[PDB]
Amino acid sequence: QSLHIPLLKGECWWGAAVNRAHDMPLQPGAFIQLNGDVSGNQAVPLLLSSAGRYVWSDQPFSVKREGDILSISFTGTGALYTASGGSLKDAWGEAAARFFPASGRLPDTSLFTAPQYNTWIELIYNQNQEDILRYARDIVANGFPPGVLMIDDNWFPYYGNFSFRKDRFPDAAGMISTLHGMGFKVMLWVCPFLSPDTEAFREALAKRIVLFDSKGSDTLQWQHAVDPAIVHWWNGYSAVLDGSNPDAVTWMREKLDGLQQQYGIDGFKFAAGDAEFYLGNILSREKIGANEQCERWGRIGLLYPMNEYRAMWKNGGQPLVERLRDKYHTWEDVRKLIPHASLAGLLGYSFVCPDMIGGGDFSSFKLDQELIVRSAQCHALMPMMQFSVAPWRVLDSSQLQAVKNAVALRRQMLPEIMKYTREAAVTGMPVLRSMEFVFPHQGFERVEDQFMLGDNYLVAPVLEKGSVRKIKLPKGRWQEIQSGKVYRGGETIELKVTLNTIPCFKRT
């Protein structure tokens, strides 16, 4: 089933995939495939336009813009809709309320009320008790606020064994107790992959909770398959849980619940689950597609309020934290944070965290100190802020101070962040809003280096080198919160900036 949609004059379209937001508004020649592909992050079968139009299907589709016409090919069925208000916000609001209504619930508020810290970039695969405790002590000693600490990949003996590796964690319970005492909560990285020659693999094969190999047979049914699917991913080759099988859910809950009971773990970073891992010669118990495997992995987080996901299909309006994917240590990537985060919010992902300050791609790790500072300042007034590489280790004293000052500004602004976070639970309305969302039809369709925190604060993080920053103000009066200088709105201004400037304006 297909659909051709001529653009309205001036109309701009966004949607489909968080990790394609930098390519939007959709341009002539643009192509996005959702079927079997979440583009390395979150994806939703939704398009929204600046004229209040929207496209939804319950199922994946592909979209191409050819000239001034959208061509959409649906695997199921879909339709074009118009909201009568005629703005992006109206499209968002009607599509949300029809197709991904707000659940009424928040993720664990500890994820918002302090910065987050992830051991990934600092320790990589050498996750061990001594170094994790040291990183935590270091956070405290450098005057950073204790928050949620995420112990990343490889704290366990092998994939599918949900226990601390005793060689590197002689007393994990003691470690967690010490971390709690210091004011941290703790999350563990978990995934649905199973090292496919181990005790856990054989148990899961016997329980029939893995995805099976179809052998490329047309006819072979799940109930008769004998061999597991083996999937290649970034860590190697593994068996994988079948998210359509209720018994897989039971198994996963037993594992996670056990870590909570035994060690006091507060929550889980849900890794992987990307649709692409479910393609090919694979048999699932309930015969669902690859996208819905990803979606059902996402549902696990509904049982653990302290959660985070990178890969997602649907689950808009839900109490899941949605992280932007691994960012490179580049200026190009720091300029993705805002448009990616703002799109995430329109797709129903209000609780968006922008990856890791300074970069989340471990291979990157000559570091650029200025970039790290600008990355930190851009995180600060986003819904959540996440560190990994240790600022005190990689920065000199005044770059470090500027990071501390970013954290201080987040602290000053937290009541506002939390007001809109709490409201997002109820209404689904994003915390971080695009300029277009708040100020429709005022020339902001392509302004992606500015965002609104709620309705009243305009944030314009410095996202390049240079001592000059341009800021497009909507009509109205705007007071810069640090300088206190009031600006007449309805023009673009030039601001002299230093390493420490985070331009932010209150609507008056």
195 close to 201: Cβ distance less than 8 angstroms: yes
- Position among 361, 368, 416, 423 found at the interface with ligand GAL (CB under 6 A): 361
Residues 385/390/394/395 CA torsion (nearest 10 deg):
50
Question: Quick one: which segment of 125-133, 256-264, 358-366, 423-431 binds ligand GAL (CB under 6 A)?
Answer: 358-366
Q: What is the smallest separation between the CB atom of 194 and a copy of itself, expressed in angstroms?
A: 9
144 close to 405: Cβ distance less than 8 angstroms: no
152 binds, among Cl ion, ligand GLA, ligand GAL, none (CB under 5 to 8 A by kind): ligand GLA
* Under rule CB under 6 A, residue 317 binds ligand GLA: no
Radius of gyration in angstroms for the set of CA atoms belonging to the chain, rounded to a whole number: 23
Closer to a copy of itself at the Cβ: 232 or 366? 232
196 binds, among Cl ion, a copy of itself, ligand GLA, none (CB under 5 to 8 A by kind): a copy of itself
Which of 162, 164, 175, 173 has its CA nearest to residue 135?
175
User: Could you give phi then psi for residue 133, rounded to 5 degrees?
Assistant: -60, -35
Question: Quick one: which segment of 33-41, 152-160, 243-251, 449-457 binds a copy of itself (CB under 8 A)?
Answer: 152-160
* Under rule CB under 6 A, residue 234 binds ligand GAL: yes
> Between residue 103 and residue 132, which ones bind a copy of itself under the rule CB under 8 A?
125
Can you read off the two tokens belonging to residue 341?
């985060």
3-state secondary structure labels for all residues of 278-345: HCCCEECCCCCCHHHHHHHHHHHHHHCCCEEECCEECCCCCCCCEECCCCCCCHHHHCCHHHHHHHHH
67 close to 6: Cβ distance less than 8 angstroms: no
> Between residue 315 and residue 334, which ones bind ligand GAL under the rule CB under 6 A?
325-326
* Under rule CB under 5 A, residue 365 binds Cl ion: no
239 binds, among ligand GLA, Cl ion, a copy of itself, none (CB under 5 to 8 A by kind): a copy of itself
Helix (H, G, I), strand (E, B), or coil: what is residue 458? strand
- Position among 22, 134, 165, 255 found at the interface with a copy of itself (CB under 8 A): 165
- 224-255 burial, b at 16+ Cβ within 10 Å, e below that, comes to ebeebbebebeeeebbbbbbbbeebbebbeeb
- Can the peptide bond before residue 391 be classed as cis, meaning omega within 30 degrees of 0? no
Binding residue count for a copy of itself, defined by CB under 8 A: 28
User: Which parts of this chain interact with ligand GLA (CB under 6 A)?
Assistant: 120, 152-153, 189, 271, 310, 325-326, 360
Binding site for ligand GAL (CB under 6 A): 40, 234, 325-326, 361-363
Contact set with a copy of itself (CB under 8 A): 125, 154, 157-159, 163, 165-167, 193, 195-199, 201-202, 205, 227-228, 230, 232-233, 235-239
